[PDB]
Design a protein around this nucleic acid. Structure first.
Lengths: 397, 524, 76, 50, 228, 248, 230
RNA sequence: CGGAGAGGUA
C-alpha cells in the first residue's frame, strides 16, 4: 500500500496489477535521487507570501518537517496567493493553513504521476483504480502503421518523445543538407562548428529493426531539404511518434450507444472504415535464429542443397542457403539451409527399411534447416550473419 | 517418494493435465446466437475437428487416405465447409472459464462456425461464467465420444443449467444491456405522439410504433388476450382492455401463452426481469423459459439500440445547492474546530463531530442529486406540468440495474466523499469533488490509497478463496445422494432469522426446496 | 431437431440414467447393430437417440428387451 | 520556441504558468552511471572508491 | 464485375396469414436494406379497404355503453378494425350491419353489396342479448394506404357529421404483422453472406405471399425509370 | 468509426473518456472547419484569424498566438498539419473546464452538448434521443487475437508426463486444472472427466486407437482396463503389496 | 395513384461532391428510398483501385529506397488514395517514371487513353535527390467493396515475382452518402417530397450513372421478390 | 521435454 510520503516521489497510480502491485513503483515526473540515494522532489520556495521560482529538492524526510502548499494554489502579482487560506500537506494528511505559514509549493500540478500516467487526459475524472488500469495499458500500446497525434493530450508527449532515444534529435543546429528514408545529413551552423572541420552531422535512422517485444521500430524523417534546425529539435519521428509528439494509438470517431447488443460488457464495435484506412494496423518482427554447430559427426553447414526437398522450397533461397530478403513466406517454408554432417551412417534396420520403402533420400548428411514455424508468415527484411574468425565468409556475409 | 509427488498421484491432478482436442481464445459478444449456441472461429473448428473431418471425407469417398485428407483440409477447398457443417451440425462444445469457482464455470453450447478469431460467447451466459470481455480468454473442449456428447447435451448445456446450483434461482438473468433496453421500452411517459388511442391487440401497437406514428411510450388502452393456466393444466384466453404503453404491448408479444400480464407492465428493472424469468420457469417450465429468455434478449438489445441511450456530460446533473450544503459543512466544522482550539471539545469529540457533519453533507448532496434525477423531465398533459419517470439516460442507466448503483451515480454527479486513509481510518475531510467536476491533486492522491488497498485485497482474496475452495472440496467430495427415503422423521427446527426488530430473512425463502420432518398444522 | 432434454426428463425422471441409456442407443446405431427409428435430419446419433427417447419409443424396458434380443440372435 | 513546435502547435489549456520545465526523464540512469564511471580525486562512489 | 443474385426463395405458410419467407443468399448489407425497404413499403403504404366512419343509434360516444346492448362501443370499434373487407367497386361505399335477435353478431349478418366481399366468414363483432336484441350500424368502408388515425381526418375536414356519426380509425394495410430478421449465411469461403427471413401476417383479405410480391412490384415500378 | 458500450462508463467511473470524446469532437470540428477553408482556399488572413481564435480560446491560458510565426509558409504548413484537428494539451489536474469545451464546440459549429442525433445505418431511422459522438484516442494493446488463439487435436507430445506441451508450431493443449475437474464433478458430469483424464490426455495407445476409431467414422471409446490404473497397480504390487480387485 | 420519382438537376459542388434530387416521391417513400440508395451506394458500387505496385528499386514493403523522403510503406499508403478511373477495360497497368528533386505527384504518371487521373495533384512521394529516380508500375483494376490483403494470392497461389507490393484495394468510389427528405411543392396534389442525396465520391463515377447503377442493382434484387418462385 | 527460480498479462 502507498505511504503518504510517495507524494511527488513515485507514482501512486501506476503499478502492475499482478502479484506485485505496490512493490514495483515508477518514479514521478520531477522526482530524482539525492547523492545518498534517497529521493527528493522539487519545490518552489515561498519567501513570506511570495512563491519564488527558486527550487529546492526537498528530501523524503525534509518534506516531513516542512509544510507544502498544493499545486492548485492560484497565484497573482509576483507569486502571492489569492487565498489567505490554502490547502497544504504537512505529514501526508491535508490541512488548511494560513498563506503566510506555508514553507514550499509543488512546482507543477503533474508532479505526482509517472510519465505513463501523466499522458492520460482528464485524469481528474477517472477512478484511481480505473486510471491505474489506464496507465498500465498506456505501456502495452503497440506502434500502428502510422503515428497519429492524440487530439486530446497532456503536453508531455513532446518531452517523452524527445527524452526517449527513439527520436533522432538534432545534436548540432544547422540546415538540413540531405534528407532520405534512411539518413539525415545536417550542414551544421558555422557558429556551432568546431575547430578544424567537423563538417556535417550524419544521423543514420533505425529502419524496421525488431524491438524486444517483436514490435517494429523505425524512424520517419519529419524534416525536409533546406529546413533550418536548431539544437534539441526532432529530425525524425520514431515509432509511435508524430512531429516529436508521442503518438501511442490513433484517433477514432466514437459514438456511445449500445448498438444492437454488440457492445455487451466493454466490447467495442469498430467500423469497417478502420480496416479500410489500414490504421490500427501493426507491423511485427520475428527473429528466427539459425546457428551452425560444430558436432562430433561433423560441423553443421549452411547450404542451399537440401536432401529430400522439392524445388519450391529451394526456389526462395540464394546460392548460400539463406532465403532472399523480401520473399513472402509462410509457416513451413525453409529459411536457412542448415545441414548436419551425418557422420553416423549406421542405423537400425527399421530406419533403413522405412527410408527405402518411403522413397526418402539416403545420404551421409542429415537435414537441419530452420523452416518457418507453423503459425507465422510474412516477408524477410533482415539477414544477419555472425561468423567468428576461422570460418569462411559466404556470399550473404 | 515415487509413490507420491506434487500435488499427489501425478497423472490424476497437478501437475499438470493439459489435454488435447481443446483450444483457448479471447471472447467476443454475439447477440444473435441463441442461448444454446456459441460462436466459434472457423479456423478453431477446422483444427478442433480434424479427425472427424478426415473420417467424413474418407466416408464420402472424397479422400482415399489420411494423406489425401490432410491435403484436402489444408487446401481450404469449399468442400470441407460442408464436411465441417456436417460434423458440427449438432456436435456441442464445452466452454470453461480459466478459473472455475462454481459449477456453471464450464458449460456446453452448440457451436456456430463464424468468421473472425475470437469465440463469440452468448451475451447472456457470460454473467453466469463470471467472465467479462477484457481480453480474457475462454477455453473450448470437445467431448468427442457419443456418451460424453450426451453427458454434455443433457447436463452441460446452458439451457439445462439456468438456475444457480448455489441457491436455486436463475443465473441466466439479463445483466446490463438487454435490461437497459427493456427498462427503456417498458417505461411510460405523460405525453407523446400516439397518446390515448385504442389498438387491436399488440398487433396494432407494433404496426403503429414501427410506423413512427405513435411514440413507443403512451397511455394506451389495448385489448389484449392473455392466457392463464388453470384447472388441470388448461389454458383460458382472458381478453380484456388494459391501460398500458405501446412498447409494453410490443413486449407482451414476446411473452408466450400462460403468463399473466402483471409481469410485463411497470418499468422493468433487473429484479423485475429476474422475477419474470423465475415465474416463467416455475409456471411453464424450461422450454418456454429458454425461448422467453432468448427472445427477450433479442428484443432488449434491439430496443436499446432504437433507444439510443447515451452517456455524455450534460446528462450527469450537478445539484444547484451542492456547494451551499458544502459551505454549510465547512462553516460547521470551522465552529467545531474553533471550539477545539478553545479547548471545548476533545480530539475524538471533534473528530466524530466533523465526520458526522460530512456524512450529513454527503447524504444531503446525494438526496438533492437523486431528487434532481427522478423528475428531471417534466411534461405538460394539456397545459399543466407533470412529473414522470425521467427521460434522462443516466437515470435509466442505473435505475434499470443495468450497471452501477445509487452509490456510483451518487459519486459521479455528487461527491464520493468520505473514505479511509492508511491504517484504514476515515479522513476528516471527504473527497468533496465529483468526477463531472475536477479532482484536486491531493484529493486524487488520497483516493489512490483506497484503490491500491482494494487491488491488493482483491489479489489476496482470490488466492485465499482458491485455497478455501480446495479444502472444502477435499472435505466434502466423498458425499453422494444414494437413497431416496430413509424414513427419518428426525429433522431440524427451521425458523425465520430475525435480529432485533428487523426480520433479516423470511421463512418463506428458507422453507422452499426442503422436505418437512413432520406434518405442519395451522396456527389456530 | 431438438436439443432440449425436458421430454426425456419427464419420461425418465432420473434424467441421469437417461444419459447412459441414450448414450448406449447412440453407440449402437452409430456403429452397426441397430438403425435409426426416427427420420434423420443430418443429425448426430446423439440427438436422434434423444428424439427417440423423447417420443417414449425408447425406454429402459424396451431397450433391455431389445438388447437381450440381439444377443439371443447372435448366439443362434 | 522550436521549429518542430511551429510545425504543429498543440493547443494547451493549462492555467498555471509552469515554473521549471520537465527535467530529462532518464536523469536517474545517467546520474548513476556517470557517478559510477567517472574519475574521483577523493573517495567517492565508483571504481575509485572500490 | 459480378453480382450475386439470391435465387431459390423458400416459403412456409401457416393458414393464409402467417408466412415465414426465407431467402438465401443476400450479400453483405443487402439483406437488411431489402428487409427495411420491404417493411416500410408493406406497413407505411399499401392499398387496402378499411372502415372510416360509423353510425351510432344514439349520440356518438367513447365512454358510455351501447344503448340497449350490454357491450361497449369501444369493443365494437375494435372488432370492426379486424373485419376483413375487400371493396371491388368504388372506394367509399356504405355498409349496413342490421341484425335483430339474440346471438353473436358476426361478419355474415352484414349485407353483401356484390362488390364488397367479406373473406372472413365468422368474425365476432357484437353480442346481442335481450335488452332490445337489435343493432343497426351504418359504416363507411373506403380505400386508403398505410394507417390513418381518425383525428387526422377530422382535423382535415371542416365539415362535421351529425353527432352519432363517429369517425373510426382505418387499418388500410392488409398486413398486420410485419417483422424481418437477418441471420448469418455461408457460401463456400465467404461467411459474410446473410439469409433474410421475413415473418408477416395478413388481415386475411389477401395471401401474405401475394401482398409481399405486389409490394415488391410497387417498389420495382418505383424504380422503373432509374434502371438501364 | 467506433461504437462503445455506454454501460462501462457509469459503473467503472472512467467518465474521463466521455470528456475526451467531447473535446475530441470539438477539436476535430475545428479541424473540419480549417480543412473546409483549405479546400475553399480561403485567404491566408482567414486561416490566421480563425486559428488565432481557436488558440485564444479559454481564460488565463498561456499558449501565445501568431502572428509571430512566418506570415504565409509557416501558417500554411501549420494549417495543413491542423486539418486533422487541433491537438489539445490538457494538464492532468490543471486542465480544461466544461465551459471551455463547449466554447470549442461553438467554434466548431457542432452541438453544445456534444450530442448529435445519429441514424442507424442498419434501419435508417434516427434514434429516439440524440447520442454522444466525438473523437476518442484509442490504443491497440499488444494482446492481439492472433497471439491468443491456439487449438489442437494432435501434435506435440512430452515425456514422463504424456500431455501436449511446448513448441509454437503447434502449441500444447489447455491445462485442465483441478478446478475444471471439480466443476465437472459438481455436475453429474462423469464420463467427460474420464476422457479428459484417461483417453485423450495420457494413454498413448488409447489416444492412437481412439483417433483411429474417429477416423473410421464412429465416435468410439471403451472403458475396459484403465492404463493408469494398471500402471499404479503394478507399481503397488512391486512393493510386495497385493491389490485385490474385489467387486462390491 | 403512385407517381414515379424523376431525376432533376444534379448539381456539382465539386468533382468529389454532388447533389442528386428526386422530386415526385409519394408519401412513405422518402426515408425508405433514401436508405435504399445510400446502402446500395456505400455497399456495392464499381470502382477502380490499385492492387499491385512494382517499384523498380526496393525489394519489399519495409525496404526504403535511397533518395525518397518516404518509406515504401508510406508510398503504398498514398497509392491507396489514388483517384483513378478506367472505362475502356477492366485492368490496366499505369507507369510512372520521374527523376530529379521535387514532389512526385499523380500527374507525372504516364497515362493511357483509357485511364483518367481525376485527382492530378495527388502527392505520391517526395524525391529528394538529383541522382535518385523513381520508377513505378501500378496495377489498377475494377472491383467492388473492399478486398483486404488475403485473397488474390489465392488467385495466383503466392506472388511468384519477388519485389511485388500487395496493397489493400478499396474500390469504393463513394465515401459519403447522405439523404434528406424535404417538402417539395408542385401543382400536382399537395404532399410530395424532394429526396436530396449528398454524395462525396473520389471523382471516378458520375452521380447519374452511380444512381442508375444503384437502382439497377436494387431492381435485380427485387426481381426475386416480385415473383416468388415457391 | 520432467520439476524449481524470474519478469509480464489476465
Amino acid at each position: 500500500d502507498v505511504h503518504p510520503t510517495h507524494y511527488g516521489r513515485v507514482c501512486p497510480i501506476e503499478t502492475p496489477e499482478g502479484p506485485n502491485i505496490g512493490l514495483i513503483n515508477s518514479l514521478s515526473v520531477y522526482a530524482q535521487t539525492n547523492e545518498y540515494g534517497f529521493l527528493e522532489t522539487p519545490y518552489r520556495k515561498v519567501t513570506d507570501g511570495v512563491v519564488t521560482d527558486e527550487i529546492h529538492y526537498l528530501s523524503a524526510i525534509e518534506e516531513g518537517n516542512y509544510v507544502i502548499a498544493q499545486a492548485n494554489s492560484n497565484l497573482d502579482e509576483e507569486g502571492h496567493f489569492v487565498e489567505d487560506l490554502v490547502t497544504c500537506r504537512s505529514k501526508g494528511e491535508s490541512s488548511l493553513f494560513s498563506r503566510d505559514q506555508v514553507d514550499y509549493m509543488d512546482v507543477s500540478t503533474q508532479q505526482v504521476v509517472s510519465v505513463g500516467a501523466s499522458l492520460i487526459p482528464f485524469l481528474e475524472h477517472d477512478d484511481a483504480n480505473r486510471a491505474l488500469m489506464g496507465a498500465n495499458m498506456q505501456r502495452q500500446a503497440v506502434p500502428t502503421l502510422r503515428a497519429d497525434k492524440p487530439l486530446v493530450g497532456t503536453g508531455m508527449e513532446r518531452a517523452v518523445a524527445v527524452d526517449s532515444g527513439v527520436t533522432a534529435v538534432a545534436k548540432r543546429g544547422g540546415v538540413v543538407q540531405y534528407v532520405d528514408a534512411s539518413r539525415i545529413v545536417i550542414k551544421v551552423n558555422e557558429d556551432e562548428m568546431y575547430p578544424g572541420e567537423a563538417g556535417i552531422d550524419i544521423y543514420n535512422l533505425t529502419k524496421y529493426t525488431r524491438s524486444n517485444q517483436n514490435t517494429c521500430i523505425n524512424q520517419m524523417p519529419c524534416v525536409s531539404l533546406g529546413e533550418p534546425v536548431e539544437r534539441g529539435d526532432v529530425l525524425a519521428d520514431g515509432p509511435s511518434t508524430d512531429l516529436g509528439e508521442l503518438a501511442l494509438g490513433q484517433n477514432m470517431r466514437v459514438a456511445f450507444m449500445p448498438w444492437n447488443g454488440y457492445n455487451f460488457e466493454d466490447s467495442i464495435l469498430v467500423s469497417e472504415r478502420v480496416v479500410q484506412e489500414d490504421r490500427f494496423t501493426t507491423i511485427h518482427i520475428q527473429e528466427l535464429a539459425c546457428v551452425s554447430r560444430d558436432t562430433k559427426l561433423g560441423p553443421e553447414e549452411i547450404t542451399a542443397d537440401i536432401p529430400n526437398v522439392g524445388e519450391a522450397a529451394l526456389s526462395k533461397l540464394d546460392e548460400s542457403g539463406i532465403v532472399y530478403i523480401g520473399a513472402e513466406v509462410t509457416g513451413g517454408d525453409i529459411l536457412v539451409g542448415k545441414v548436419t554432417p551425418k557422420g553416423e551412417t549406421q542405423l537400425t534396420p527399421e530406419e533403413k527399411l522405412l527410408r527405402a520403402i518411403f522413397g526418402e533420400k539416403a545420404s551421409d548428411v542429415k537435414d537441419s534447416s530452420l523452416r518457418v514455424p507453423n503459425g507465422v508468415s510474412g516477408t524477410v527484411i533482415d539477414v544477419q550473419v555472425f561468423t567468428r574468425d576461422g570460418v569462411e565468409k559466404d556470399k550473404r556475409a | 517418494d515415487m509413490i507420491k509427488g506434487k500435488q499427489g498421484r501425478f497423472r490424476q491432478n497437478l501437475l499438470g493435465k493439459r489435454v488435447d482436442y481443446s483450444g483457448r481464445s479471447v471472447i467476443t459478444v454475439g447477440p444473435y446466437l441463441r442461448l444454446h449456441q456459441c460462436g466459434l472461429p472457423k479456423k478453431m473448428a477446422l483444427e478442433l475437428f480434424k479427425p472427424f473431418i478426415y473420417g467424413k471425407l474418407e466416408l464420402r469417398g472424397l479422400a482415399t487416405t489420411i494423406k489425401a485428407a490432410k491435403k484436402m483440409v489444408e487446401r481450404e477447398e469449399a468442400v470441407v465447409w460442408d464436411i465441417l457443417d456436417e460434423v458440427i451440425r449438432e456436435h456441442p462444445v464445452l466452454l470453461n472459464r480459466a478459473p472455475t469457482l462454481h459449477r456453471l464455470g464450464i458449460q456446453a453450447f452448440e457451436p456456430v462456425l463464424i468468421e473472425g478469431k475470437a469465440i463469440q460467447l452468448h451475451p447472456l451466459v457470460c454473467a453466469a461464467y463470471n467472465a467479462d470481455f477484457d481480453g480474457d480468454q475462454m477455453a473450448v473442449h470437445v467431448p468427442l465420444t457419443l456418451e460424453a456428447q450426451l453427458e454434455a447435451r443433457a447436463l452441460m448445456m446452458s439451457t439445462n443449467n439456468i438456475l444457480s446450483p448455489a441457491n436455486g434461482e436463475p443465473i441466466i438473468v439479463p445483466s446490463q444491456d438487454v435490461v437497459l433496453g427493456l427498462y427503456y421500452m417498458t417505461r411510460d411517459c405523460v405525453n407523446a405522439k400516439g397518446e390515448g388511442m385504442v389498438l387491436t391487440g399488440p398487433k396494432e401497437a407494433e404496426r403503429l410504433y414501427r410506423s413512427g406514428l405513435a411514440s413507443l411510450h403512451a397511455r394506451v388502452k389495448v385489448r389484449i388476450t392473455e392466457y392463464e393456466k388453470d384447472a388441470n393444466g388448461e389454458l383460458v384466453a382472458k381478453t380484456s382492455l388494459k391501460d398500458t404503453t405501446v412498447g409494453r404491448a410490443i413486449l407482451w408479444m414476446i411473452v408466450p401463452k400462460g403468463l399473466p400480464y402483471s409481469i410485463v407492465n411497470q418499468a422493468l428493472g433487473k429484479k423485475a426481469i429476474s422475477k419474470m424469468l423465475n415465474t416463467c420457469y416455475r409456471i411453464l417450465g424450461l422450454k418456454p423459459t429458454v425461448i422467453f429468455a432468448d427472445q427477450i434478449m433479442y428484443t432488449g438489445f434491439a430496443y436499446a439500440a432504437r433507444s439510443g441511450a447515451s452517456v455524455g456530460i450534460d446528462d450527469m446533473v450537478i445539484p444547484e445547492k451542492k456547494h451551499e450544503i458544502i459551505s454549510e459543512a465547512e462553516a460547521e466544522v470551522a465552529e467545531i474546530q474553533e471550539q477545539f482550539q478553545s479547548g471545548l471539545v476533545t480530539a475524538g469529540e471533534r473528530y466524530n463531530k466533523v465526520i458526522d457533519i460530512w456524512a450529513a453533507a454527503n447524504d444531503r448532496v446525494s438526496k438533492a442529486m437523486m431528487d434532481n434525477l427522478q423528475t428531471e423531465t417534466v411534461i405538460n398533459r394539456d397545459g399543466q406540468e407533470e412529473k414522470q419517470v425521467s427521460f434522462n439516460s443516466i437515470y435509466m442507466m442505473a435505475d434499470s440495474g443495468a450497471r452501477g448503483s445509487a452509490a456510483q451515480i451518487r459519486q459521479l454527479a455528487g461527491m464520493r466523499g468520505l473514505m479511509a486513509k492508511p491504517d484504514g481510518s476515515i479522513i476528516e475531510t471527504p473527497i468533496t469533488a465529483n468526477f463531472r467536476e475536477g479532482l484536486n491533486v491531493l484529493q486524487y492522491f488520497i483516493s489512490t490509497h483506497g484503490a491500491r488497498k482494494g487491488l491488493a485485497d482483491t489479489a489476496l482474496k482470490t488466492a485465499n478463496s482458491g485455497y478455501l475452495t480446495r479444502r472444502l472440496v477435499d472435505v466434502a467430495q466423498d458425499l453422494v445422494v444414494t437413497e431416496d427415503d430413509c424414513g427419518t422423521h428426525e429433522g431440524i427446527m427451521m425458523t425465520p432469522v430475525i435480529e432485533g426488530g428487523d426480520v433479516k430473512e423470511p421463512l418463506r425463502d428458507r422453507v422452499l426446496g426442503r422436505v418437512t420432518a413432520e406434518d405442519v398444522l395451522k396456527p389456530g | 431437431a431438438r436439443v432440449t432434454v425436458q421430454d426425456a426428463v419427464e419420461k425418465i425422471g432420473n434424467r441421469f440414467d437417461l444419459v447412459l441409456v441414450a448414450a448406449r442407443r447412440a453407440r449402437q446405431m452409430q456403429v452397426g447393430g441397430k438403425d435409426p427409428l426416427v427420420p434423420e435430419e443430418n443429425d448426430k446419433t446423439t440427438v436422434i437417440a434423444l428424439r427417440e427417447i423423447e417420443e417414449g419409443l425408447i425406454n429402459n424396458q424396451i431397450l433391455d428387451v431389445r438388447e437381450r434380443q440381439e444377443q439371443q440372435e447372435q448366439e443362434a | 520556441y522550436s521549429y518542430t513546435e511551429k510545425k504543429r502547435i498543440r493547443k494547451d489549456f493549462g492555467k498555471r504558468p509552469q515554473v521549471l520545465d520537465v527535467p530529462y526523464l532518464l536523469s536517474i540512469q545517467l546520474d548513476s552511471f556517470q557517478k559510477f564511471i567517472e574519475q574521483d580525486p577523493e573517495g567517492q562512489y565508483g571504481l575509485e572508491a572500490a | 464485375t459480378e453480382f450475386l443474385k439470391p435465387r431459390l426463395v423458400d416459403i412456409e405458410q401457416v393458414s393464409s396469414t402467417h408466412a415465414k419467407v426465407t431467402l438465401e443468399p443476400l450479400e453483405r448489407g443487402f439483406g437488411h436494406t431489402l428487409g427495411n425497404a420491404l417493411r416500410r413499403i408493406l406497413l407505411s403504404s399499401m392499398p387496402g379497404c378499411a372502415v372510416t366512419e360509423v353510425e351510432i343509434d344514439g349520440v356518438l360516444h367513447e365512454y358510455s355503453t351501447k344503448e340497449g346492448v350490454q357491450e361497449d362501443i369501444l369493443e365494437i370499434l375494435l372488432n370492426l378494425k379486424g373485419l376483413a373487407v375487400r371493396v371491388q367497386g368504388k372506394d367509399e361505399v356504405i355498409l349496413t350491419l342490421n341484425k335483430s335477435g339474440i346471438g353473436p353478431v358476426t361478419a355474415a349478418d352484414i349485407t353483401h353489396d356484390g362488390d364488397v366481399e367479406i373473406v372472413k366468414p365468422q368474425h365476432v363483432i357484437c353480442h346481442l342479448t335481450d335488452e332490445n336484441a337489435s343493432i343497426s350500424m351504418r359504416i363507411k368502408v373506403q380505400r386508403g394506404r398505410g394507417y390513418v388515425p381518425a383525428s387526422t381526418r377530422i382535423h382535415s375536414e371542416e365539415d362535421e357529421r351529425p353527432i352519432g356519426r363517429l369517425l373510426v380509425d382505418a387499418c388500410y394495410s392488409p398486413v398486420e404483422r410485419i417483422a424481418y430478421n437477418v441471420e448469418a449465411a455461408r457460401v463456400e469461403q465467404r461467411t459474410d453472406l446473410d439469409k433474410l427471413v421475413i415473418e408477416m401476417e395478413t388481415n386475411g383479405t389477401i395471401d401474405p405471399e401475394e401482398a409481399i410480391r405486389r409490394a415488391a412490384t410497387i417498389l420495382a415500378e418505383q424504380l422503373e425509370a432509374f434502371v438501364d | 468509426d467506433i461504437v462503445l458500450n455506454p454501460l462501462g462508463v457509469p459503473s467503472r467511473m472512467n467518465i474521463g473518456q466521455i470528456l475526451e470524446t467531447h473535446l475530441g469532437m470539438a477539436a476535430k470540428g475545428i479541424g473540419d472547419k480549417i480543412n473546409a477553408m483549405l479546400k475553399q482556399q480561403q485567404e491566408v488572413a482567414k486561416l490566421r484569424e480563425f486559428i488565432q481564435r481557436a488558440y485564444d480560446l479559454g481564460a488565463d491560458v498561456r499558449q501565445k498566438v501568431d502572428l509571430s510565426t512566418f506570415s504565409d509558409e509557416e501558417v500554411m504548413r501549420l494549417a495543413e498539419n491542423l486539418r486533422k484537428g487541433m491537438p489539445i494539451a490538457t494538464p492532468v489536474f490543471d486542465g480544461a473546464k466544461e465551459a471551455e469545451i463547449k466554447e470549442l464546440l461553438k467554434l466548431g459549429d457542432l452541438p453544445t452538448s456534444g450530442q448529435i442525433r445519429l441514424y442507424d445505418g442498419r434501419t435508417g431511422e434516427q434514434f429516439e434521443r440524440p447520442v454522444t459522438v466525438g473523437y476518442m484516442y484509442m490504443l491497440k494493446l499488444n494482446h492481439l487475437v492472433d497471439d491468443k488463439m491456439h487449438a489442437r487435436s494432435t501434435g506435440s507430445y512430452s515425456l514422463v508426463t504424456q500431455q501436449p506441451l511446448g513448441g509454437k508450431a503447434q502449441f500444447g493443449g489447455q491445462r485442465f486444472g483441478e478446478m475444471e475437474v471439480w466443476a465437472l464433478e459438481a455436475y453429474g458430469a462423469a464420463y467427460t472427466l474420464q476422457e479428459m483424464l484417461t483417453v485423450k490426455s495420457d494413454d498413448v495407445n488409447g489416444r492412437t486407437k481412439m483417433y483411429k476409431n474417429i477416423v473410421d467414422g464412429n465416435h468410439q471409446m471403451e472403458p475396459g482396463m484403465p492404463e493408469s490404473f494398471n500402471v499404479l497397480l503394478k507399481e503397488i504390487r512391486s512393493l510386495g503389496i497385493n491389490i485385490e480387485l474385489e467387486d462390491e
